[PDB]
Design a protein around this ligand. Structure first.
Ligand code: ZN
Lengths: 217, 177, 389, 188
């Protein structure tokens, strides 16, 4: 339900006590360690995976009841914990790979929870540009979008929304002739969209982690 | 008609009192005595060498703005000849345009450029390190010692046998050698 | 009357470069309205001079130096490169690693040498009007995509001089694409996977992309006029053996027995269509379209467009072998282009001598030149409209 | 300069201590770090497509001179005076090469370059942490390491196996890099 997703940017400028500093780091390590175990013992799209991950997120207090916008306790905890835990894992390359890998599974899970209407607002609040299309235009180009779609069998074009993005941002999709192109824009379904979002988040996070280790002394 | 060899071990220079002269101490073989003896060789007239870096445009030092007049080697030549040499009491010198590289920690220097190479006697006064002018931005080689110049120019790699051509005889002894 | 003399080239080249070359339009195009600081002073030109002399990193300050240094040198060939962070003639000044290309137009080339298995009318060194359709069909195949699929507005089409065409995409957002994006764009438009003599080069699925559909639709209007009546791909046993080499093995016997009863190429093509449809109905790779696409779809080279620092032939140049001027092509009349009516430097000069500088208005080069400022004019409209408001 | 805290304690089994023979000179040669190559005002490493610089090319000649001296000493039935001359020559080239980084990090040096020194040092601590990861993966314990030495606990009692185990670490590190080479120092 809530807007707990964030591209982790703009480090916190607050100040905290030592007890909170230690507790946030320990809790974040626990969460990320259990995400890997859930991924190993199950698959990413089962009821058990979702249920256990959500229960654990409830237990560690990383998404819960509301507060006045800014000092939303779970959002604040999540932000400060992530930026604290960057310092611990910036040192080694094996640690960097682990941190990058585990921090994307949580983003995938959280994006899987969003209602079908808040995704547009999240995307617009995100980097610069993602836009959706109405049912009129979607039906206008329905046949061309279906033909341009990959070898997936049948004409099952459900109610899932379709997003228009600049062609360059969809590079990995258009060089293989796997999306419909019209005047510098590509019409993409949800799955490829979340793939693009994950790839961009991975690139930004890798850049930030590489930069952090420089200023560690 | 006469040439003599010697094996140098140590070198000495007195910039303050005897500028532009170096002393080489070593060993010289003697046929009559069937043994080597100590030897001292005086090397004189080592010239100061400096490199002037021209600007891409003439800068008015009074304000700090360009005047739009292009800069060439000849402009630097005349500015040195009529402004710097007379000011710092320099009688005779030699000037030449050279092409040189530079890859070190002084800002705003090209990695390949044309410099004005000026050579003059070491007896004449020493220019300041930070000397600047209208036509040249920087100067290199101001405080280079004579021994390093002699070593680098002649490519002496440690102790070795050196040939001296046209040897001369000192009027009065200058060493216990 | 007299044979064309290539040794006279130094004589005519002088007055061409003095009185005919459009220096003003050249400067306007390569300056792009003077929007950015040194978009022209950082441009690299390559001059191929006498004795195959190859000088690469050139640069100029403004128009006057440009005219002066082409009039004092008179190069045999002129190539345009990318814009760099430092002046190309001043690259040894900077440290090794700080000199790199930044922006360049998007260049496509199409050449006759890529159709060695398609032409049965002239040899490798010859062109003729009845195969030049392979060049015009390409022009409307690609120009559509860049206008529709990718939304590129300002495109310039130039004659290579003897056996091909060049496309310069000069849109503002196209000049700053990364090399990976250009490679992806070339991948999108590439259909024939021509390797080192592979038997089959075109593969299709049950579902065809709209790009493929429109490409087939465009080719259909010229297929029978060129392939079936002008090339006669079905007139000798060795001739149709090439096509049978691509058909599935079970069909050749029936095709041979149906073809032996035929009497004209059109009837053979119709019989092939019927046989293909009949085989389709029982068992669909679309047999009717692979041989049609393989024989007519243009083939591009990735290396030309992938490189951001590539050097390509400049417009309004002179071919030193044939003499033909690398002239812009008018997009309004593409199907009626004739390579053999392009005026040479020799053609206009001889009549003229028997009679700020604007002497080109009375020349035969002028009607083709009016195409160029039309391309130039459209660029200021984009600048004036979108930027100022 | 990275330093790994020693694992204080008493050890019963054989301990293999290794040396990084010119760790810093090897980094200058590995990543092409020079005055005429590194773009500076921590700077970024140069592209691998560039040619060798002035400084890396002078370290090549120093270690290409050692191998010929090393192999020339392998001959038998040789004059007793040449044995010392080649051994002295080998040590002279060994000493000169190792102290090359000093002209970059010495504040009172004529060729001082702060950005250049920082880049070499930063890569140095990466190679150190990388080596530590490899050793612990093959069920071996690192009990100390400081920038020119590594002490490894082997849990072995057979001396023949210790050298065999030691040469395996040699190949493991030398697989990823090319010029830096570890060397056996002694056994406790
Ligand atoms: Zn032909």
């Amino acid at each position: 339900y809530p807007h707990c997703l964030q591209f982790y940017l703009q480090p916190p400028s607050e100040n905290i006590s030592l007890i909170e500093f230690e507790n946030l780091a320990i809790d974040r390590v626990k969460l990320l360690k259990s995400v890997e175990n859930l991924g190993v013992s199950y698959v990413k799209g089962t009821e058990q995976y979702q249920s256990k991950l959500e229960s654990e997120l409830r237990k560690l207090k990383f998404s819960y009841r509301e507060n006045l916008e800014d000092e939303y306790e779970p959002r604040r905890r999540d932000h400060i914990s992530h930026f604290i835990l960057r310092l611990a894992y910036c040192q080694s390359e094996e640690l960097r790979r682990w941190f990058i890998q585990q921090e994307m599974d949580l983003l995938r899970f959280r994006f899987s929870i969003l209602p079908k209407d808040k995704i547009q607002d999240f995307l617009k609040d995100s980097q610069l540009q993602f836009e959706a299309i109405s049912d009129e235009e979607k039906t206008l180009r329905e046949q061309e979008i279906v033909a341009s779609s990959p070898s997936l069998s049948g004409l099952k074009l459900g109610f899932e929304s379709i997003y228009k993005i600049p062609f360059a941002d969809a590079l990995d999709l258009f060089r293989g002739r796997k999306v419909y192109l019209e005047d510098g824009f590509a019409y993409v379904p949800l799955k490829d969209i979340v793939a693009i979002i994950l790839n961009e988040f991975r690139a930004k996070l890798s850049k930030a982690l590489a930069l952090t280790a420089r200023s560690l002394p | 008609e006469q040439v003599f060899h010697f094996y140098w071990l140590d070198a000495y220079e007195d910039q303050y009192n005897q500028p532009g002269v170096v002393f080489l101490f070593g060993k010289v073989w003697i046929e009559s005595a069937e043994t080597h003896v100590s030897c001292c060789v005086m090397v004189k007239n080592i010239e100061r060498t400096l490199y002037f870096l021209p600007r891409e445009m003439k800068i008015d030092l009074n304000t700090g703005k360009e005047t739009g007049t292009p800069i060439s080697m000849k402009d630097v030549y005349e500015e040195f000849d009529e402004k710097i040499a007379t000011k710092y009491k320099i009688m005779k010198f030699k000037s030449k345009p050279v092409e040189k590289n530079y890859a070190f920690e002084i800002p705003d220097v090209p990695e390949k450029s044309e410099y004005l190479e000026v050579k003059y006697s070491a007896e004449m006064p020493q220019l300041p390190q930070d000397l600047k002018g209208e036509t040249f931005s920087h100067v290199f080689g101001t405080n280079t010692s004579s021994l390093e110049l002699f070593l680098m120019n002649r490519k002496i790699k440690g102790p070795c046998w050196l040939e001296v051509k046209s040897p001369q005889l000192l009027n009065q002894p200058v060493s216990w050698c | 009357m007299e044979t064309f003399d290539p040794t006279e080239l130094p004589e005519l080249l002088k007055l061409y470069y003095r009185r005919l070359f459009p220096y003003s339009q050249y400067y306007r195009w390569l300056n792009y309205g003077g929007v950015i600081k040194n978009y022209f002073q950082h441009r690299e030109f390559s001059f191929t001079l006498k004795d195959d002399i190859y000088i690469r990193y050139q640069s100029f300050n403004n128009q006057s130096d440009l005219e002066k240094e082409m009039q004092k040198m008179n190069p045999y060939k002129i190539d345009i490169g990318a814009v760099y962070s430092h002046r190309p003639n001043q690259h040894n000044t900077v440290k090794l690693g700080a000199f790199q290309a930044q922006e360049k137009e998007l260049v496509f080339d199409i050449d006759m040498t890529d159709y060695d298995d398609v032409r049965r009318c002239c040899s490798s060194a010859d062109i003729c009007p009845k195969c030049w359709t392979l060049m015009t069909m390409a022009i409307r195949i690609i120009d559509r995509a860049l206008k529709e699929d990718f939304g590129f507005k300002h495109r310039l089409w130039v004659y290579s001089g003897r056996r091909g065409v060049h496309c310069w995409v000069c849109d503002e957002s196209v000049r700053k694409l990364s090399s990976a994006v250009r490679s992806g764009i070339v991948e999108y438009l590439s259909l024939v996977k021509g390797g080192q003599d592979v038997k089959k080069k075109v593969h299709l699925s049950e579902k065809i992309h709209p790009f493929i559909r429109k490409s087939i639709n465009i080719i259909k209007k010229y297929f029978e006029e060129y392939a079936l009546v002008n090339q006669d791909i079905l007139e000798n046993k060795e001739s149709w053996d090439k096509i049978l080499a691509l058909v599935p093995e079970t069909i050749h016997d029936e095709l041979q027995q149906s073809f032996q009863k035929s009497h004209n190429s059109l009837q053979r093509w119709e019989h092939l269509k019927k046989v293909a449809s009949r085989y389709q109905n029982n068992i669909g790779p679309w047999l009717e379209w692979e041989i049609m696409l393989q024989y007519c779809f243009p083939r591009l080279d990735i290396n030309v467009s992938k490189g951001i620092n590539h050097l390509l032939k400049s417009p309004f140049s002179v071919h030193p072998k044939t003499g033909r001027i690398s002239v812009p092509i008018d997009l309004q009349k593409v199907d009626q282009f004739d390579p053999f009516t392009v005026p040479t430097i020799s053609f206009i000069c001889r009549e003229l001598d028997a009679i700020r500088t604007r002497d080109y208005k009375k020349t035969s080069l002028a009607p083709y030149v009016k195409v160029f400022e039309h391309f130039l004019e459209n660029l200021d409209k984009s600048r004036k409209g979108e930027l100022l408001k | 300069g990275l330093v790994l805290d020693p694992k204080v304690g008493f050890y019963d089994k054989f301990i293999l201590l290794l040396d990084f023979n010119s760790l810093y000179p090897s980094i200058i040669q590995e990543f092409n770090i020079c005055f005429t190559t590194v773009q500076r005002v921590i700077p970024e490493l140069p592209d691998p497509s560039l040619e060798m610089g002035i400084l890396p090319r002078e370290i090549r000649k120093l270690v290409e001179r050692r191998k010929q001296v090393k192999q020339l000493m392998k001959q038998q039935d040789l004059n007793p005076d040449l044995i010392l001359q080649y051994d002295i020559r080998q040590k002279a080239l060994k000493l000169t090469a190792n102290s090359m980084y000093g002209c970059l990090g010495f504040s009172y040096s004529r060729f001082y370059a702060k950005p250049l020194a920082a880049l070499v040092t930063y890569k140095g601590r990466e190679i150190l942490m990388h080596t530590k990861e490899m050793v612990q993966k093959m069920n071996l314990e690192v009990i100390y390491g400081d920038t020119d030495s590594i002490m490894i606990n082997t849990n072995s009692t057979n001396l023949e196996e210790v050298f065999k185990l030691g040469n395996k670490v040699k190949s493991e590190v030398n697989k990823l890099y090319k010029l830096l080479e570890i060397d056996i120092d002694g056994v406790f």
